Each structure stands twice: as structure tokens, then as C-alpha cells.
Design a protein around this ligand. Sequence first.
Ligand SMILES: Cc1cc2nc3c(=O)[nH]c(=O)nc-3n(C[C@H](O)[C@H](O)[C@H](O)COP(=O)(O)OP(=O)(O)OC[C@H]3O[C@@H](n4cnc5c(N)ncnc54)[C@H](O)[C@@H]3O)c2cc1C
Ligand SMILES: Cc1cc2nc3c(=O)[nH]c(=O)nc-3n(C[C@H](O)[C@H](O)[C@H](O)COP(=O)(O)OP(=O)(O)OC[C@H]3O[C@@H](n4cnc5c(N)ncnc54)[C@H](O)[C@@H]3O)c2cc1C
Ligand SMILES: O=C(O)CC[C@H](O)C(=O)O
Ligand SMILES: O=C(O)CC[C@H](O)C(=O)O
Ligand SMILES: [Zn+2]
Ligand SMILES: [Zn+2]
Lengths: 467, 466
Amino acid sequence: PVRRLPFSTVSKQDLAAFERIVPGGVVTDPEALQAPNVDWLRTLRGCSKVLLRPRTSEEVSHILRHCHERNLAVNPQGGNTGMVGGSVPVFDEIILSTARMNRVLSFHSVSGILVCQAGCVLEELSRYVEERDFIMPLDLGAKGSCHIGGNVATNAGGLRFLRYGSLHGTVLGLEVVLADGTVLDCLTSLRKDNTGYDLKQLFIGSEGTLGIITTVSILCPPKPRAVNVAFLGCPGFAEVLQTFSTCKGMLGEILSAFEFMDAVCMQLVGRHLHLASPVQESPFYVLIETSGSNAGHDAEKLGHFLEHALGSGLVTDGTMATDQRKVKMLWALRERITEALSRDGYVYKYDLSLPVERLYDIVTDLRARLGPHAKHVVGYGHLGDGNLHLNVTAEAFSPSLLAALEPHVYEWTAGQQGSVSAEHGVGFRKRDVLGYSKPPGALQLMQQLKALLDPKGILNPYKTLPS
Amino acid sequence: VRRLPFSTVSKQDLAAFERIVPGGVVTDPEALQAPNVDWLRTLRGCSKVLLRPRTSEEVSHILRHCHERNLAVNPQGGNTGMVGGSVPVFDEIILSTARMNRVLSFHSVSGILVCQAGCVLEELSRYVEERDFIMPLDLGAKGSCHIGGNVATNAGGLRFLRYGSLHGTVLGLEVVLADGTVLDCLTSLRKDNTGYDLKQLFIGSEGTLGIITTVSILCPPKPRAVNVAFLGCPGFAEVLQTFSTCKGMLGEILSAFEFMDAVCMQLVGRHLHLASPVQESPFYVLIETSGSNAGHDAEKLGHFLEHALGSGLVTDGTMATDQRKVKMLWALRERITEALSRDGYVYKYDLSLPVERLYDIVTDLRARLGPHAKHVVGYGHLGDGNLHLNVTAEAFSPSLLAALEPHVYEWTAGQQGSVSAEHGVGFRKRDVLGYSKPPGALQLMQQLKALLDPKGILNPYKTLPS
Ligand SMILES: Cc1cc2nc3c(=O)[nH]c(=O)nc-3n(C[C@H](O)[C@H](O)[C@H](O)COP(=O)(O)OP(=O)(O)OC[C@H]3O[C@@H](n4cnc5c(N)ncnc54)[C@H](O)[C@@H]3O)c2cc1C
Ligand SMILES: Cc1cc2nc3c(=O)[nH]c(=O)nc-3n(C[C@H](O)[C@H](O)[C@H](O)COP(=O)(O)OP(=O)(O)OC[C@H]3O[C@@H](n4cnc5c(N)ncnc54)[C@H](O)[C@@H]3O)c2cc1C
Ligand SMILES: O=C(O)CC[C@H](O)C(=O)O
Ligand SMILES: O=C(O)CC[C@H](O)C(=O)O
Ligand SMILES: [Zn+2]
Ligand SMILES: [Zn+2]
């Protein structure tokens, strides 16, 4: 298995130092510590004996200063919604939670620049800015629990990535605490600033291996005056792809989301979540969202788009909604897919970037490769961004079924020059499969960067670079 | 200011470079004069060797040799940079990407373009536009600037408001490191979270951490309808409300929002002989839209102009959907920088400030600078809070520089602004980062610099504090 690196252990003196550093922010009770040690998928559990919950950036700096001198490994944790085992300890690394770093520092109603602490939950940030007629540039099904610091640390994609793009573009500045406790202030709240290297980009997608994000500056797009969502049934994946091409051609700049899900996904969300399908039974379903400034113009685009899609046979049945209650219910069919799979049994999860034309080929293949040993096999995700979420469910974990999935799925993906982790990141699960998507020379530079910023390696060990 | 202890180019080095790049070794000093002079014509190197490699392997092999010999190398693209970064300070080897001008691939569905770093931006725009796509950036230097130079400086530009930074639109880079190591981050995927986003280090590194040789970039679709509204505003307060209503009334179709003052219009008319199409106003704004339905776009701006002219935000205006007239309106703005360098000596500052206070420094400097400056102008990317502040003088005067500096840099810091929003640092601003970056940030930049280029052969005297 994996072996524990020669870190120190948490002593009584360390617990006393943490109570001094974070008064009332030291949890050592083993039953309370059980939940933060187990990941969201509940397939990994650490043996951490202390979870620290600082309130301020200075406290985070001082904690790591103490941990750097004492050589104690630290596992930063936000909402603990990560999918790659990066959010929980492997052995006894101190859990540093951002749960109390949940304050908004400022929001400028003209520029739409938000400055807030890393532990602010994304949905509450969305409600804050939408009260001021702006929106967050990303949204995910984990919005209710995931923290913005975790989102930046994982470079979270999400459901509006098609419209607003990466956090690499939307993060304007970061405050980061490094492994030795130096608070690196790169918290520029400016749209444009070319005064040296864009150091904050290193920490976007680094997953707490190069430093702990404590404050985030984010560009909030304006809240759209008109939001429409269309939910369509397609008779095949070829029609889904041409529907997407027609979608870009006819809706254009107002398109804010394009998601797909197969029939089995719809069945699972119907079975486990009791959500009736709003369309005719189809092999594939598509969720399109539009955001724009003129409701009348957006209605014309979508109407003419829909007229052509049904007329040319790309869509068999579809429905549309503008009412906020109904719009959210259609989104629920997509956002809650992840919940229904993990409740269906053991989930074999694969998050792949592939050529959009070949996005679903692996799902048909794995249904053929995997006999009755797979309970269900589903494919869905962000088709507009080339993102497939490949999931296999079974009654329980099987080494035989794992051997059929791996390395086959990773070799398939590499054959398409694709990404084995499009969005969710590397963490513990995918640390040894980066060669499928990254060349050795790139991986070495990541290691040299790690040694520069965290030479003792106390920040998220066993993560997220190869051994 | 003083030359670092690099080796000097020997006769054996020129023979070695001829083996590596046959026919790519230019040593004629008169031909070497133009690449030695920056675009602003205020920095001049004394380099005796210009190298024009064709392939990434030729760049790797040149730098392995340069790494062995500790010879300084000055990467160069279109030589349109504004911060003295693109020319040697002393005798650095100029490595031009002029011949690295091949498109490697373009997928007509995803719109992802992979091309060599030396491809000129305007030529690439024509190429992807022949396939109904566009570059995610465009600059006034489009006719000369290289995509490798654009990525190395993290160029913002005139459509930054719509498509954003190269940090978002660049998908992958192949970079040759100081020791010749070829770093392959040339992924053509929209989303890829397999480790650190190493390419981001080189976006804005200005050739100090490596030489970008191949670029992968997401090209947005070419819009079906481009409209340009050129309006005259009676004050900067009216400019700001024209911008605010614009976002509310045009919204997602908005692709550019530029502003310029009256003095800017006078210099482009005087030096470039371009006539204004609207009545004389103290401020002009250029609004561009890009959308998929030409009809919906036309209706959105018509309602916007009717309200803008109705509410007194605009006094006179013109509009064009014709490709010819759209370029004529755009020509008045893109080459203002050309019209400024032709007015005399130009003191140039590229500032990010709160948009509401963006022009306050222009009024301040005009009051502070009496008759001792020729003109003080303010223009640039108002949508991005990016002010191009320029002061002209009949000749350079150390008096006028002492009046402007550090005052201009201190003013911006008082606003928590950027002392180089767009153009970068280079040679001129290497010692002005304290106004925008704290010491801990600047310290880490040197640590990354020491890791990626321990000998410091790549772009010496750049772009970090001394
Ligand atoms: C229902 C559901 C839907 C999801 N949908 C999406 C989706 O659409 N797109 C997508 O990309 N992902 C998605 N995810 C996974 C995604 O990675 C997480 O939801 C989220 O982005 C991580 O935030 P978090 O606060 O939960 O971080 P955690 O899970 O707590 O941590 C994840 C990693 O980040 C590190 N980290 C956390 N906080 C910090 C910090 N302050 N500083 C430094 N490092 C830190 C941790 O050490 C760990 O390595 C989904 C997950 C769920 C459960
Ligand atoms: C008329 C005009 C308008 C402009 N408008 C804008 C604008 O709107 N926005 C904006 O941001 N800038 C603007 N610029 C300046 C802009 O920074 C440059 O024009 C351009 O982005 C750089 O390309 P280049 O080929 O000229 O690079 P160069 O000038 O040759 O070099 C620029 C710097 O990057 C380095 N470099 C160049 N190529 C490479 C490479 N392949 N690999 C590594 N390092 C490299 C050089 O060493 C140097 O430090 C304008 C310039 C002009 C003359
Ligand atoms: O699909 C999954 O199981 C993981 C979450 C995914 O990012 C989503 O888009 O919902
Ligand atoms: O204006 C300047 O001094 C330099 C060029 C500038 O980036 C522009 O937007 O035209
Ligand atoms: Zn997803
Ligand atoms: Zn500019």
C-alpha cells in the first residue's frame, strides 16, 4: 500500500499551541473527527486526531508556522465535496478546515468584484451577489457545501463553464498561506494587472499542495435579465452532437449551459429521487440554459432553435421553462445525478476530457466489456466543454470489475489524447495515472515547484503528484 | 544598468549556431540595428548576433549551448512591446521567432488553433476567419505582433472585455526552458486538471522563464454581425453612464467599450490625417457588439442609442455594420499610440484604476503640469478599468519626469491600482513593482526565476526588480 512519511505526531504541547493560536478552534474528539476524516464518496477514511478551524488569515499563518517547525503534515479541507480523495487525510495529518473563514470582505456593485474568505460556501456567495444583481462565475451541484477556496484549489469547472470559462481567468487575486506560514498577498482586485508573474495561477488547481488559500477575489458576471432552460430528448448521440452544433449556431452568445445525460441516468434519478421525467422516454437527454439581457430576443432565438431541432429530427420531444420553480426542477435532473449513483451502490468514477465526437463511445464500450457485474453504467457531463462523467455502479466493490475498468479506461482516454481528470483533479485517487495525460518533463517541473514552496512536504502529502 | 558577467559570443559560437540553425545567423550590424531598437525607439541594444530559428528543436539546441556557455539570450517577436523588454540592454543574443510562423493544426469544430509562436496575429486572424472563427484577442499591433509575444506579455487588448485573458483562452503551450529543456504543456483540451497548470507560469513571464515556441489557443466563433457605435460625450461623467447603460441595454453582445478624450482625436487627425466622423466633443466612446442574430443586435443598440441620445449621455454619434466603415472607426482608436509617438517625446503610463476615478489623474496632471507639457491625454479600455495615460513634450525634460514620477505611480497605489495593467514590466518598470506588488510576492517571482533559469540567461535586466 501507501507508506506514511516520517512526519511527527500531534503532542499535547501541539494541542496547547493550537488552542493558543485558535482559541475554541481545536477539535480532538474522535467521534466528531470521524466525519471530516471520511471523503464524500465514503471510500476513504483518514486517522487524523485533530481538526483545526481558524477564523482569520493570521491564524492560518501561525498554525502552519507551528506545523512547519514541528514537522506536522496538514490536510486543508473545505466543503469536503471533492471526488478524488484529496479532501481527507491518508494517515494522521492535521485537518485545517475553512468552515469559520466565511466572511465577505467587500463587493463593488459597479465592477462586480467580490472579495471573500476561502471558506465561504458557494451557494451563499451566489445568494449574496444575486441579491446585488450579479452571479458567481461558476456553479456546481455541490454548491450547497463546497467552499470557494476549495473551488479555486481544485479549479472547479461546473455548469456555467461554457459561458464564463475557467477560474484561471475569473480569479483576480488570492491571499495564500504557504507551508512555512508566510502569507503571500496576491490579492489584487483589478481586472487587469501585468506587474510580474501571475503567481496566483499556481494555486488555482493546486489542491492545497502549494499553499492554503485564505481569501479569494473573484469577478462576478452580471445577473442575466432573462434565463431560459430547454430540456430535450434525443433519439441518439449523433443527434445530441448536431443539436449542440445547431445550439451554438442559433443561440450563440446567449448559450450559458449545455449538459447531457443518457436514459439510465434519467431512470436512476427517477428511481432514487422520485423525479418524474418531463419528456418522452429517450436514450439521451439534453439540458440547455440561456442567459441574456433581452427576454424577447432570447425567446425568439430559442423558439426558432427549437422549431429547427424538432423539424430536422434532432430532438424527439422537448420542454422549456422560464418560471424559477420549474427552471430549477429541470436543473435538478442533472445536478442530482451524482447523488443517485452513489446511493445506487459502489461508484466507479471517471472524469474525462475527450473529443466531443467520441465522448460517449467509452460508455457503449464499457457496457459491452462489463457483463452483469456492473449494476449500471452511465455517461453524462459537460458536452459543450468535452467533459464526460463516466460512472459504473455495482452492488459492491469488486477487484475483478476494477481490473476490467483500469487501466483500460485510462489507456482509451490517452488514445484520444484526453484528460483523465478534466475537472475534479488528481488528489489521492489519480496521483499515479497522470502519465496518461501529462508528459514526464511536465510532471518533474510540478515536483520542483512543490519542493520550492513546500520543501518539508507538510501540505497534503501523498497528493497530488506522482510518487 | 550594469552588465552581468555573461560570456561573450566567440567565433566558435557563431559556427556552432550555424550548425544548429543553418541560414539563421544574421551578423550584419546594419541589419542588426532594427531588431536592436524597441518600438518606442528609446532603448537600443548592442547585440552582434541575431538568430532566426525555424523549429522548436532548433530553439532547444540553441539554449542548451547557451546554457553550457552562459550566453544571454533576448527573445523577440514582433518588437511592438512598450516596456523595453524586447530588445537587449547590452550584447544579449536576439532569438527571433520570425521564421517560426507555421500553423500546425486547426480543428473546425472545437475551434482550437495550434500554431507556432512567431505567427503574426493579423495573419492568424485571417486564417481562422477564413474558417469562420476569430482570435480571442486583437491588438493595435496585430500586423506585427507575434502570438508568442502576445502570450509572453499576457496582452489584454480591445476584445478583452468579451473573451478575457490569455490565462483563460490559452489551452496549452510548448516552452523551451533556459537549459534547453522542452516543456510540453501543449494540450488541446478545454478542461484538464491533471496537476499544476504549468502553462500559466509562462503567460505573462515575458521570456524570463522560457521561450514560448508553440501555442494552443481557443478561438471563439466569428460573429455573424459586428456593429460599432462611435459616440461623442460631453464629459467623463457622461462616458461612465454611457458605459453603465450599455452593459444593461446591450449586455452579452457587447464586445468592446473604448474611450478617448478630445486631445486624442486632435492628434490622430493632425499626425495620421484621419478625420473625425462626429461633432467635436471632449470625450469619445467606441462601442462594438458581436452577436449571432444581426436583427436582435440592431434592435438592442437602436433602443440603446435612442435612450442615450434621449438622456443626454451622447451629443452626436455614428454607427457602422459595413466592414469598411467599421475598420475606419476602429482606425481612429487603435493607432492613437502611433499618433502620440509622432507628437514628440511621450511619457507613457498603463494604469488599472477604479473606473469611476479613471480620468481623475488626467485632470490632476493637467492641473499639476502647466505649460511645461505639450499634451496630456487619457484613453484606453474603460470597460476593463485600464487607462492609457500619456504626456507629450516637444523634447524630453528631466524636470517633467520628476513632476510625473513617482507622483503617477504613487497616485495609482493610493487607488490600489496597477502600475502596468497590460503592457507589462520589461526594462522600464522593473523597479516600479513595489507600487503594485508586496515584497513577498516579488520575492517568490525571483525564486521561480532562480528555479527555471538559475544562470539568468533568459532576458537579463528584466522583468523583476534589480
Ligand atoms: C454533488 C457534487 C457535484 C460536483 N460538481 C462538480 C462540478 O460540476 N464540477 C467540478 O469541477 N467539480 C464538481 N464536484 C467536485 C468538486 O471538486 C468539489 O465540489 C469542489 O470543487 C471542492 O470544494 P470543497 O470545499 O468541497 O473542497 P474539499 O473537497 O474540501 O477539498 C478538495 C481539495 O482542495 C483542497 N483545499 C480545500 N480547501 C482549500 C483551501 N482553502 N486552500 C487550499 N487547498 C484547499 C483540499 O486539501 C483537497 O485537496 C462536485 C462534487 C459533488 C459532491
Ligand atoms: C500600436 C500598438 C498597440 C498595442 N496595443 C496593445 C493592447 O491593446 N494591449 C496590450 O496588452 N498590448 C498592446 N501593445 C503592446 C503589446 O505588449 C505587444 O504589441 C505584443 O503583445 C507583444 O508581441 P511582440 O511580438 O511585439 O513581442 P515583443 O515586443 O517582440 O516582445 C515582448 C516581450 O515578450 C518577450 N517575448 C516575445 N516573444 C516571446 C516568445 N515567443 N517567448 C517568450 N517571450 C517572448 C520579449 O522578450 C519581450 O520581453 C501594443 C503595441 C503597439 C505597438
Ligand atoms: O459525476 C460525478 O459523479 C461527479 C460530479 C460531476 O462533476 C457533476 O458534474 O455533477
Ligand atoms: O497606448 C499605448 O501607449 C500603447 C498601446 C495601447 O495598449 C493601446 O491600447 O492602444
Ligand atoms: Zn461536472
Ligand atoms: Zn491597450
